[PDB]
Write a protein that binds this ligand. Structure first.
Ligand SMILES: CCCCCCCCCCCCCCCC(=O)O[C@H](COC(=O)CCC)COP(=O)(O)O[C@@H]1[C@H](O)[C@@H](OP(=O)(O)O)[C@@H](O)[C@H](O)[C@@H]1O
Ligand SMILES: CCCCCCCCCCCCCCCC(=O)O[C@H](COC(=O)CCC)COP(=O)(O)O[C@@H]1[C@H](O)[C@@H](OP(=O)(O)O)[C@@H](O)[C@H](O)[C@@H]1O
Ligand SMILES: [Ca+2]
Ligand SMILES: [Ca+2]
Ligand SMILES: [Ca+2]
Ligand SMILES: [Ca+2]
Lengths: 523, 523
């Protein structure tokens, strides 16, 4: 395939596949090879021809994932009949997985470029939709049976390593690149963008902890080189995030984006106070309030690391678990806010009842404290003779006995649901990250000085990848075939390219000699 | 069907279906189309005739749900053989679901008016039973396989929107009404009764929080217009609830009814104290005690909102979860009351043992406090040399270590059981609400002033519904067929009626043109 069909043709392919799934899966419950042949025939084109059949069979995965999207819409609309459409959606996902795994054997470049990565357009209504591809489509709706395909994961691995890159000419194509052969655009790969963001997060943390522990004298400090590099890095981060915020408006509202914005916003306020102190009110007062508000950013700077270590399996599985647990705890937090607003209005009315509001601050404080179990009735002892005790102990009962134990229940159920699906949801997280990666002088000097051995290791590993790809292309293999040097295959791996062939010849000679050492040891 | 059979005939139809389910489902384990034909034949009537077959096939759903009722009674009586009758009850529910979904395709008005909504009478014993219909019957016994039918949910949607209304001539009929066409009786619909109760609950809350935060001076306040509107609304609510309490006696004992009665009772006491202060003992003392007891009603006024937002899915799912969790925690609360009564009798006997009861109040206080974890042994330090310590620490062990952790266990199990069945139990809750909705000058001025834009939005949405129903009746559709404008159907929705037909003609012209742009893109 080289030219894309029109959106109404892709709409017809989607309707033929939806009709096919409605006929083959009409019940809660299959995917025979005749059904797979029907799915291949549901697109259209002359069976006498080829590259006209492939032109419409290129949109097969995109159309099956839009069928999954439509069945999710159907389950949203017919809430009572959600199980039938969830069954149909799952059947579509399994058929899609079968198609991806079949075309992985048939032709790999056609699977990657045309089926999975090409951003097709579809006319769902009279409106024309944005160009999405099957990878982004399967990740947005969390098609875990599709994301856990061998071809899907291979495509994500090739994109991750930078082996497939977005075409600058057309942003819907994703041509391969030649890594067989110190290019700078190689550092634009998702592996190296991820690794450099990880190194820069650890470097940001190291510059942070060398600043907040910098205050030794009560006077204004020297404003060292590391403090300047630190505020330069943070003002770079806040201008990057505010350019993305102005450009991408109200879709930059991810939790991690707001978390980083809170981190950089706090450090910018600290920077401003420090700058005002350096060029002055009281200079030591501004320096003190600067280091205090900067020290408020230390949980954010140490919790930033989990975002930039999501590629590591331990941290990513942990954050998948935490995302599901907070998503379950939304119930507790709504009930806690409602009960807290109710009893807060009660106590503030008891405060206003005598005539003047005098202990409003201790009320807000102590009631907020009650969720931690640290609440004391000493504050309300001189308040109202039966009313404060009744309200406070009813509130403490509803929070500590009822709602916190409900929170433990929600967390237990959320963890039991997510620990079974931890690998699948982590694969969806890494897929989301991989597809996210395909959409002054002092700082540069510091970056060059600090990133040098990492660039060295990246370059030597890239040369090892290039020699591996050269070996895999010397044979008729798919550029990632010899990476592990496994025991069950006597002809695999890469020694460093004739030393590897000599090692394989040694392997087959020793194996064939020692098998034929006794003629009865056969079959 | 136009005339209802007698209760002994409906009893015979119920017995024939019970016999049929006993023959087809004799084991723990089916519902073949011959069984569905047998169920149609189990009612009776001449197969040569029609409207005499339909006269007795009208009670098929009511009779299958009484069969479900009888199998629930059987499982209550034969506790050992409860699994067989639960199987039979489930089989009856599935057969009933099949019948509802079949008659939804066959004839919709006959499904709604005659099968589901007509309140038939049955002679279970020599006594004659009340007129119940299949909707109310399936909700009282929680027939979730029947409530989650497409026809059941459609019938509930039509009742909810006011499209089917109870006949004033006969209260067992439920004739349709004509919405095709600013009627006041349109506001009597369950959608608008629900929405106006929601708006009035938020308005009650807004008037409440503008009163308890009204006290600024220690003297008696001005008795503003909002305070008078607030006490008028609350005395209207308490007279409404007491008329319902006198009329419906000891079946008005729902939790939410008692909760609202507690809210309105507290506000009435506050109203009485405020009224006595205004027309006087000490006036500022009565004003103070009025605002204190009114501020005691703030958790009730803020927790009232969950009742009037049950139609919203988030709040309704949350309250379904909370109902199941409290139903599980009944064990903990019984054991807690028993252990508390035991150790309370122990400490009060230790108080009486020296000769006089002097610290009884601190005993009741501290032991009640122990469940919150705030208990201190300082109160009992000067009490008895080994006895108070042994009793108090045994009590604190049984409450904090044993029983509160048991409460966490009960909550975990209750949430794990209800989160799987959250949609089904919420559908049963909304079904219960929908069937609940089919069983002075200053206040009117305030209501007219405050409900005006909501009445405006209701009227413009009603006109949109009327034009939609006019379009769906111009075709041979079922008055709710074009509501979503879906992508998989090229002929659906309502544009605002020739603009919609022009849009559909544009859709078919563009689709047929772009499909036939290449003749090979076919089939
Ligand atoms: C008062 C003093 C207290 C100070 C604070 C103390 C520190 C608190 C530590 C909090 C850490 C919690 C980690 C949980 C993260 C997670 O469990 O997930 C989040 C849910 O947690 C929540 O709500 C938590 C609500 C409270 C939701 O994550 P997300 O929706 O924002 O999606 C990302 C996006 O898509 C991309 O981020 P970026 O690349 O950077 O742009 C992806 O790279 C990334 O992989 C994610 O997918
Ligand atoms: C000391 C200071 C403390 C002050 C108080 C603090 C606030 C406490 C907040 C409590 C809110 C708890 C919400 C749970 C509601 C629920 O989870 O459910 C309840 C079980 O909770 C319970 O036992 C809780 C026992 C403690 C049972 O609900 P229900 O039996 O009463 O049935 C309704 C009927 O049928 C109709 O009410 P109305 O239309 O208004 O007439 C239907 O509309 C409605 O949908 C329901 O079905
Ligand atoms: Ca006060
Ligand atoms: Ca080997
Ligand atoms: Ca005593
Ligand atoms: Ca359409």
């Amino acid at each position: 395939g080289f030219e894309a069909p029109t959106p109404r043709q892709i709409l017809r392919v989607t309707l033929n596949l939806k009709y096919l799934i409605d006929k083959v899966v009409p019940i809660v419950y299959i995917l025979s090879p005749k059904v797979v042949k029907l799915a291949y025939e549901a697109c259209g084109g002359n069976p006498k021809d080829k590259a006209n059949k492939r032109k419409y069979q290129s949109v097969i995965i995109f159309s099956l994932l839009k069928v999954c999207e439509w069945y999710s819409i159907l389950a949203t609309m017919e809430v009572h009949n959600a199980k039938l459409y969830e069954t149909r959606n799952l059947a579509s996902q399994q058929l899609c997985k079968l198609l991806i795994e079949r075309e992985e054997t048939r032709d790999l470049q056609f699977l990657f470029m045309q089926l999975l990565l090409r951003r097709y357009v579809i006319n769902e209504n009279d409106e024309d939709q944005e160009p999405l591809n099957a990878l982004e489509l399967a990740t947005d709706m969390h098609c875990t049976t599709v994301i856990g395909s061998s071809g899907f994961q291979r495509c994500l691995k090739w994109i991750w390593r930078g082996w497939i890159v977005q075409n600058g000419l057309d942003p819907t194509t994703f041509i391969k690149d030649d890594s067989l052969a110190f290019n700078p655009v190689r550092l634009k790969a998702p592996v190296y963008q991820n690794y450099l963001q990880m190194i820069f997060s650890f470097l940001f943390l190291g510059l942070y902890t060398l600043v907040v522990n910098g205050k030794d004298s009560e006077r204004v400090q020297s404003f060292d080189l590391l403090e300047s590099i630190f505020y330069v890095f943070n003002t770079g981060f806040i201008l990057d995030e505010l350019t993305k915020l102005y450009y991408i408006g109200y879709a930059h509202l991810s939790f991690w984006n707001l978390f980083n914005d809170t981190t950089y916003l706090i450090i910018t306020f600290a920077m401003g106070f420090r700058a005002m102190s350096v060029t002055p009110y009281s200079s030591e007062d501004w320096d003190k309030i600067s280091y205090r508000v900067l020290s408020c950013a230390a949980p954010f700077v140490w919790s930033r690391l989990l975002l930039y270590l999501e590629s590591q399996r331990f941290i990513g599985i942990m954050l998948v678990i935490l995302k599901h647990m907070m998503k379950e705890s939304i119930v507790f937090f709504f009930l806690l806010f409602l009960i807290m607003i109710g009893f807060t209005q009660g106590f503030l009315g008891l405060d206003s009842a005598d005539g003047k509001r005098d202990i409003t601050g201790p009320i807000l404080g102590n009631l907020t404290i009650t969720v931690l179990g640290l609440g004391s009735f000493d504050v309300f002892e001189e308040f109202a003779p039966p009313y404060a005790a009744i309200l406070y102990y009813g509130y403490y009962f509803i929070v500590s006995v009822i709602l916190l134990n409900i929170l433990i229940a929600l967390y237990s159920t959320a963890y039991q649901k997510v620990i079974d699906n931890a690998d699948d949801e982590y694969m969806a997280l890494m897929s989301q990250k991989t597809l996210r990666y395909i959409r002054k002088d002092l700082s540069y000097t510091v970056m060059t000085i600090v990133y040098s051995p990492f660039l060295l290791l990246i370059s030597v590993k890239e040369t090892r990848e290039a020699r591996r790809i050269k070996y895999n292309r010397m044979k008729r293999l798919n550029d990632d075939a010899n990476e592990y040097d496994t025991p069950w295959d006597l002809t695999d791996g890469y020694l460093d390219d004739n030393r590897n062939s000599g090692m394989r010849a040694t392997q087959l000679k020793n194996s064939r000699s020692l098998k034929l050492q006794r003629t009865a040891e056969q079959e």
